[PDB]
Design a binder for this molecule. Structure first.
Ligand SMILES: *[C@@H]1O[C@H](CO)[C@@H](O[C@@H]2O[C@H](CO)[C@@H](O[C@@H]3O[C@H](CO[C@H]4O[C@H](CO)[C@@H](O)[C@H](O)[C@@H]4O)[C@@H](O)[C@H](O[C@H]4O[C@H](CO)[C@@H](O)[C@H](O)[C@@H]4O[C@H]4O[C@H](CO)[C@@H](O)[C@H](O)[C@@H]4O[C@H]4O[C@H](CO)[C@@H](O)[C@H](O)[C@@H]4O)[C@@H]3O)[C@H](O)[C@H]2NC(C)=O)[C@H](O)[C@H]1NC(C)=O
Ligand SMILES: *[C@@H]1O[C@H](CO)[C@@H](O[C@@H]2O[C@H](CO)[C@@H](O[C@@H]3O[C@H](CO[C@H]4O[C@H](CO)[C@@H](O)[C@H](O)[C@@H]4O)[C@@H](O)[C@H](O[C@H]4O[C@H](CO)[C@@H](O)[C@H](O)[C@@H]4O[C@H]4O[C@H](CO)[C@@H](O)[C@H](O)[C@@H]4O[C@H]4O[C@H](CO)[C@@H](O)[C@H](O)[C@@H]4O)[C@@H]3O)[C@H](O)[C@H]2NC(C)=O)[C@H](O)[C@H]1NC(C)=O
Ligand SMILES: *[C@@H]1O[C@H](CO)[C@@H](O[C@@H]2O[C@H](CO)[C@@H](O[C@@H]3O[C@H](CO[C@H]4O[C@H](CO)[C@@H](O)[C@H](O)[C@@H]4O)[C@@H](O)[C@H](O[C@H]4O[C@H](CO)[C@@H](O)[C@H](O)[C@@H]4O[C@H]4O[C@H](CO)[C@@H](O)[C@H](O)[C@@H]4O[C@H]4O[C@H](CO)[C@@H](O)[C@H](O)[C@@H]4O)[C@@H]3O)[C@H](O)[C@H]2NC(C)=O)[C@H](O)[C@H]1NC(C)=O
Ligand SMILES: *[C@@H]1O[C@H](CO)[C@@H](O[C@@H]2O[C@H](CO)[C@@H](O[C@@H]3O[C@H](CO[C@H]4O[C@H](CO)[C@@H](O)[C@H](O)[C@@H]4O)[C@@H](O)[C@H](O[C@H]4O[C@H](CO)[C@@H](O)[C@H](O)[C@@H]4O[C@H]4O[C@H](CO)[C@@H](O)[C@H](O)[C@@H]4O[C@H]4O[C@H](CO)[C@@H](O)[C@H](O)[C@@H]4O)[C@@H]3O)[C@H](O)[C@H]2NC(C)=O)[C@H](O)[C@H]1NC(C)=O
Ligand SMILES: *[C@@H]1O[C@H](CO)[C@@H](O)[C@H](O)[C@H]1NC(C)=O
Ligand SMILES: *[C@@H]1O[C@H](CO)[C@@H](O)[C@H](O)[C@H]1NC(C)=O
Ligand SMILES: *[C@@H]1O[C@H](CO)[C@@H](O)[C@H](O)[C@H]1NC(C)=O
Ligand SMILES: *[C@@H]1O[C@H](CO)[C@@H](O)[C@H](O)[C@H]1NC(C)=O
Ligand SMILES: *[C@@H]1O[C@H](CO)[C@@H](O)[C@H](O)[C@H]1NC(C)=O
Ligand SMILES: *[C@@H]1O[C@H](CO)[C@@H](O)[C@H](O)[C@H]1NC(C)=O
Ligand SMILES: *[C@@H]1O[C@H](CO)[C@@H](O)[C@H](O)[C@H]1NC(C)=O
Ligand SMILES: *[C@@H]1O[C@H](CO)[C@@H](O)[C@H](O)[C@H]1NC(C)=O
Ligand SMILES: [Ca+2]
Ligand SMILES: [Ca+2]
Ligand SMILES: [Ca+2]
Ligand SMILES: [Ca+2]
Lengths: 388, 388, 388, 388
């Protein structure tokens, strides 16, 4: 009932423990589960929930044929209980649209969905389950945003949006919202060349976003934001451990303010926790496809351009599919420090498993632990052959 | 916890943004979704919900054969969460009957369903989930009401009812209710010749209803109601832009107090927001069938008998089916002014798509924006051929 | 939050209006609806709900074969929202057992289920969702109770139970409960020869039950109970309009303290509202099967042994099936007087419709009105042939 | 809102009455019910709920093939309403893992799930729906815990865990938790040789657990715990009535501090209420398989090594399958004394019913009564042949 303030710092991460997993494609083989993608996880003061962009069909309905396409009029942002499937009967629709973000400021929740044709799209900002502000396309080519939660400090909650080419210079803006209303906005500044799909967190009154350059970097852009002063800066992560996909093999030396060359015009949403010696990077294991997934401890990855791993943890094995991944935290948990968490989207279907006509996913999520705990891998677990 | 008072005026409408959409016939192909029609949208102080008249079968059950018929003992008024499907397991039954209306007065909700044979029907008025007043048929031929929400001001909530022929003079009455109890009622007065199915809103302590003349006007009747004095008047919308369906082509000059001739004995429930220069009319694009849907800005449409459009927005394209449409607003939203909203019913099945045996629909709804936002079209999206 | 007191008297009943109906066998043809029978309706301070004894299978599951049998280990008392179907996913299990009753005393709800073999059955009394008192069989032959709600006055809520033969003298007792605990009990007294299945209501601090003599009366037993003094008496309804089924045709003169002869060893649960000139009897239309259903106004039916009908209302037509019927009222509704209500069970399947292997039902319920409203009939509405 | 204190003693148990039963495999033949095993029952201050470890598939989905295996990444602890089925749409996931326990301390609920490979497993302790403490494997061979509720006294809630061989000496520890945090822990002490799967209760500020020796006793280990002093002791139940399974026939004299020999390396989770003359033991009827189930009154079973039964009650007959069983009580029920309750898991499928490919179960539970009530048997009730 008063706005949350990013007061604490992050706990030390010595390993990751399972937090939620829904087994959605298994259970969807014989239950009424909706076809999604682009999932994430966000918390309220009293419950943390799973989120995704619906495709408007169940996995076994006939209209599941064709769900590899990203934007259409039948998609919506939906949320559901932690670790249940997106069912037709248990899901809550937040807003209509084929790109989103959402965060709670302590008093209530802001949601933003985007819909439109490519050259005439528009975002409307929902605060306390009601429509308040709308924004229209500025550069007239697929206006999009984070696809994972935003972060708020005393009422102000910044959101990064890109409008323009995904294969050349684009127009990115950081908007500062409070209670649904635009306070100010700025264009992207600093050395990042291209921003797409930011995954963010905050600690000690600062917001950090690890984003995706689609144009030309296989190393990742980072935006640091100040919610009080309402300003931001951008860099690339210095470390040679490259975490975009597809990507060239790891070099010896990395790049701090320029894209690392080697693969152009493609990527994946990813994240990292950047906290000095306590820094952990997430990445696909295949350099060529979204398959496998690992967490790697690389001290001072952001600043040191020769930093190599110090400890690791396999989250998904290379023979299993992964996809998008992002950051969230439960800022309303009791304790001295923010515990860091992430989710990994596990895509099943087209394009890699071409023998069915649909695309869908399941979620796995994890949080940090100060113990050095043992590891297991967490694959989707459906057998595509049962759907034939 | 005290009665709502229509205090504000309407915001300026410079375009319309998506508000809710449920994709019910898509998802019903493989989920347990009920067969409906005659939908609308109404808001409580804490949530806005979708409503419709159930047919008592799911779309894929065998009893869906024959649901083109309008009145029977198996229909009921049901409500469900905003932007979910009318599912068997997520729906709430408000009352039993094949015609309805419903509004919240600030303290609690009044619902009215009607059932009976044609020559002996009856309305019972429910207030706070309990039956309170009943009214019996006065002219003994299909007693009916709005099929969309009523509007309340300080406890009084007026409802328009018609009893009699749909193809000649009928008996229409406006009843003023407070907490379920009839305060007074009047017969229709003013120049409207025939009223059927009113769609209403209020601003600055006045209620406006745009209704359907079935007998002989292709231009629409309007009733202005005063909830304090409890009086009303009626006219037709002056503008030559004709918004009933089927209808003759648009003339040059319009009619203010007489039906515009050209099509007799048929129509569709429709609406409009009548606010001086800030006036917007909704209509089907086909003059011959309920197909396509558009919003048109026609300044002073009610009074000027030569008013032509000034700006437009396509809501459904002409190759896709539409149906009934109406007005609602969220009178409990924060702000200086009432934001105007509407829904469009999208009928699928018989009679136009004769290769299945059922009739059902989905909902699309929209609210206004002061920005000039870009447009997309919003079709039902099912493929009838999957139901064969 | 303090016990309800039967303070008011009954309103005048000049006709009956629809209150709830669920269309369960229609919708069960293609939804996951449970097989029930022996339904009734009971109200809490904030909601009225539907109740029945489950058979532990859905209508279309294979285990629905054999549900004509009455007692087994798989039955339970369940409640669900007013006018929805008993679905697997929307139902609440109150207690386990193949005979029940349930009422709310103002503070919280008492439920009683009975299970056992025929010669060793037992009742356990649940108050505030917890087990409190248990009673064991006294005469060792199918211990049973009302199959419809009990009625409470200032904490005391009496329940009638029969243990023994259904085809000869039995042992009936009236137990007075308060907060789950037996205060006292008495054996049946007065002139009724055999009690089975009582349907009760209260007005002005008196409880009236119309019961079923199975042994030898086609006229019905009535028990009047005093909850303060905790005493009771019994008679038969004097009127020649006979309301049990099967039954001989209506005589000219009736019997006040003896069973009317003509049909032995069979019956149906039924009810009546006994209020001087304002008295209304419910009965099947067939004298030979449970088919058709009507309400009849017979002034002073209880006392006058020559009373004939004065006004009527057809509830179900004779070509459609009916079954059990009973009384409830919403003692927590605002108003000067108790409005009288009833439900009718509509059985579908074996034994009359032998071409399927299951038995199940739907509910229709009605309440009274002081208006003289028009009538419609309310049949189940499923087509058995869709289940083949 | 303040911690529960084990204040009362147990009521006298003169027979057992039905409390809950869900009929899950019957209803799962045609509803979306999840495949489980290892169920139990736990109560909150306001509701008692059913719990089990999910297999991540519905009974009729294809992924049900192979659910005889115990540990995998697709299992989770779920809870659902008392006496409903574990449905996809009505279940709540508590934590991820293939072994668990859970109890409410009066203020809120602690849950512990365990996942991992066999040689690197880990427990994480959830308090108030959030992850708080994690523990890693100490002896590196299937770290497991109770599979039924723990018991709390003024904030401290002890849990027994075993890590190591199931066929030789293992490492067992008793951890004392308060609000999610480890206060202390001890290794097992006293004369018990092997602990696996403890079923516990408390009365007068003492916790009693009846556990399973898998290695070599057909008589059962008992741990008595003191939550204030945080200490414990262990013995075997002295009585010759042997309650593990498989087991040799009952001897004449029993063993108080040594395993009774006769069957090595196998068992079943079971329980008992140990209260002087008021002592009741539960056991399978077959000495060779988990089939049949009975309650037996054996006065002073724990201490007297020649104690024989005095009274009995058949719960499941020998021709029907049983499985695991355990103890719970509703410590928040009104009354002078704790009423004792238990559940029995009823396994259906492989390995005994090899003609299907899945394994699943239903629950039956019972509580005590001071009346001598009559008995019935409570079998699962599905017919396997309907699943072919
Ligand atoms: C029980 O549970 C515990 C807890 O999980 C288990 O213990 C963990 O075991 C993990 C696996 O062994 C281990 O993870 C690794 O940690 C390494 C850190 O070790 C180094 O430092 C420590 C301390 O200083 C030393 O002891 C040790 O000797 C090392 O010096 C990481 O280096 C490991 O990551 C790399 O290996 C894996 C494959 O094995 C790669 O997938 C990964 O990407 C890393 O290697 C690639 O990238 C680097 C960096 O640029 C390159 O140098 C390297 O050549 C690889 O590059 C190619 O591949 C990538 C990806 O395909 C591609 O992009 C690139 O182009 C190249 O093609 C690893 O993360 C945990 O630290 C350990 N935890 C703890 C606390 O012990 C235990 O085993 C369990 N089991 C049992 C049986 O009990
Ligand atoms: C990006 O997004 C933006 C936002 O949506 C898009 O911009 C919008 O584009 C819309 C389509 O062009 C446009 O809508 C039209 O607005 C007209 C107003 O324009 C006039 O005034 C402005 C300013 O004064 C001038 O600039 C302009 O030159 C005009 O003078 C309306 O007139 C349009 O409606 C009519 O056209 C459509 C078909 O195009 C008809 O369906 C509709 O019914 C209207 O026409 C019929 O009715 C009139 C009135 O009686 C008749 O005169 C006419 O002949 C037609 O009559 C026949 O048809 C009807 C229906 O079948 C039948 O009943 C009758 O009998 C006859 O048979 C239209 O509404 C928006 O204004 C514009 N918005 C803004 C802010 O710009 C942009 O394009 C998007 N795209 C891209 C690529 O970026
Ligand atoms: C619009 O809506 C309104 C509101 O519903 C409709 O108006 C209602 O219409 C009803 C049907 O006509 C009517 O109901 C009947 O009321 C009779 C009362 O009428 C008498 O009194 C009034 C005033 O004093 C007089 O005007 C009138 O002339 C009469 O004197 C009841 O008598 C009727 O019930 C009997 O008839 C039906 C069949 O028609 C039987 O099923 C029923 O059981 C009753 O008859 C049997 O039982 C009696 C009593 O023992 C016997 O005497 C008789 O012979 C029958 O016995 C056989 O059958 C039974 C059952 O099978 C069996 O057990 C026995 O053994 C024998 O075999 C009836 O109830 C409403 O009163 C009326 N309401 C109002 C306010 O007007 C209107 O019509 C609608 N329609 C339209 C088109 O607008
Ligand atoms: C109506 O409802 C009421 C309420 O339920 C019903 O009344 C109950 O009826 C029950 C069944 O008769 C009865 O239960 C039995 O109680 C015995 C106690 O009786 C003794 O004491 C009383 C009073 O002192 C005396 O009246 C009586 O004469 C006796 O002396 C228990 O002994 C019974 O348990 C044993 O029998 C059953 C089979 O019948 C076994 O399954 C069970 O395991 C017990 O026997 C085995 O174990 C013992 C102990 O070591 C051995 O000595 C014995 O030989 C058996 O051993 C073999 O089998 C086991 C299991 O397979 C195996 O492990 C071992 O190796 C050996 O192979 C039984 O529990 C209730 O007490 C009674 N309740 C009341 C209040 O009356 C009434 O009947 C219902 N019916 C009707 C029609 O109205
Ligand atoms: C956050 O800080 C503001 C002042 O900046 C204060 O009013 C607010 O209550 C603080 N938040 C919380 C959760 O205390
Ligand atoms: C899916 O659609 C394609 C064309 O878009 C069609 O050929 C294909 O057969 C469909 N798949 C199935 C399984 O119906
Ligand atoms: C509406 O007006 C009445 C007086 O006409 C007042 O009592 C009521 O509280 C007002 N409504 C609200 C929501 O304040
Ligand atoms: C629907 O009913 C008609 C007659 O009312 C029948 O001929 C038709 O075949 C039915 N449709 C289907 C698909 O069963
Ligand atoms: C019912 O009567 C008792 C006294 O007999 C009184 O305490 C109670 O509050 C009354 N009930 C209500 C609902 O007022
Ligand atoms: C129902 O059970 C009977 C015997 O109890 C069997 O003959 C019959 O065929 C079954 N019905 C169906 C449709 O399976
Ligand atoms: C339990 O005991 C503590 C003191 O040991 C006390 O504070 C607490 O309130 C007691 N529990 C309850 C439910 O009263
Ligand atoms: C289950 O899996 C086995 C091998 O694991 C396969 O042979 C069997 O046929 C499957 N069962 C069914 C009914 O599909
Ligand atoms: Ca890239
Ligand atoms: Ca018309
Ligand atoms: Ca009889
Ligand atoms: Ca053993």
């Amino acid at each position: 009932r008063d706005f949350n303030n990013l007061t604490k710092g992050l706990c030390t991460i010595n390993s990751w423990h399972i937090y939620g997993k829904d087994n959605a494609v298994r259970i969807g083989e014989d239950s009424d589960v909706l076809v999604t993608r682009e999932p994430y996880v966000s918390c309220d003061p009293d419950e943390c929930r799973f989120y995704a962009l619906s495709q408007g069909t169940t996995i076994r309905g006939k209209h599941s044929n064709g769900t590899i396409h990203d934007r259409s009029q039948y998609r919506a942002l939906i949320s559901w209980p932690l670790s249940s499937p997106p069912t037709v009967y248990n899901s809550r629709v937040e807003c209509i649209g084929w790109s989103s973000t959402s965060c709670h400021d302590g008093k209530t929740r802001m949601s933003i969905c985007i819909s439109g044709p490519n050259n005439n799209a528009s975002a409307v900002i929902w605060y306390n389950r009601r429509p308040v502000t709308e924004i229209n396309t500025w550069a007239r080519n697929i206006l999009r945003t984070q696809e994972s939660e935003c972060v708020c400090h005393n009422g102000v909650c910044p959101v990064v949006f890109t409008d323009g080419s995904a294969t050349g210079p684009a127009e990115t803006r950081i908007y500062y919202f409070k209670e649904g209303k635009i306070l100010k906005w700025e264009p992207l500044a600093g050395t990042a060349k291209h921003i797409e799909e930011c995954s963010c967190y905050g600690e000690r009154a600062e917001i950090t976003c690890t984003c995706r350059d689609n144009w030309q970097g296989s190393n990742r852009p980072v935006i640091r934001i100040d919610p009080v002063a309402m300003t931001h800066t951008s860099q690339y992560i210095c470390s040679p451990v490259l975490t975009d996909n597809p990507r060239p093999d790891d070099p010896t030396v990395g790049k701090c303010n320029d894209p690392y060359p080697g693969n152009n015009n493609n990527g994946v949403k990813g994240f990292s926790y950047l906290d000095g010696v306590n820094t952990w990077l997430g990445r696909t294991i295949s350099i060529a496809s979204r398959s496998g997934y690992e967490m790697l401890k690389v001290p001072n990855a952001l600043t040191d351009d020769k930093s190599k791993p110090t400890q690791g943890q396999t989250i998904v094995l290379n023979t299993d599919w992964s996809g998008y991944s992002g950051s969230f935290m439960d800022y309303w948990a009791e304790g001295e420090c923010y515990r860091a968490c992430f989710y990994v989207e596990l895509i099943r279907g087209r394009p890699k498993e071409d023998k069915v006509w649909w695309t869908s996913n399941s979620i796995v999520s994890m949080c940090s632990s100060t113990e050095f705990l043992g590891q297991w891998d967490w694959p989707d677990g459906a057998k595509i052959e049962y759907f034939l």
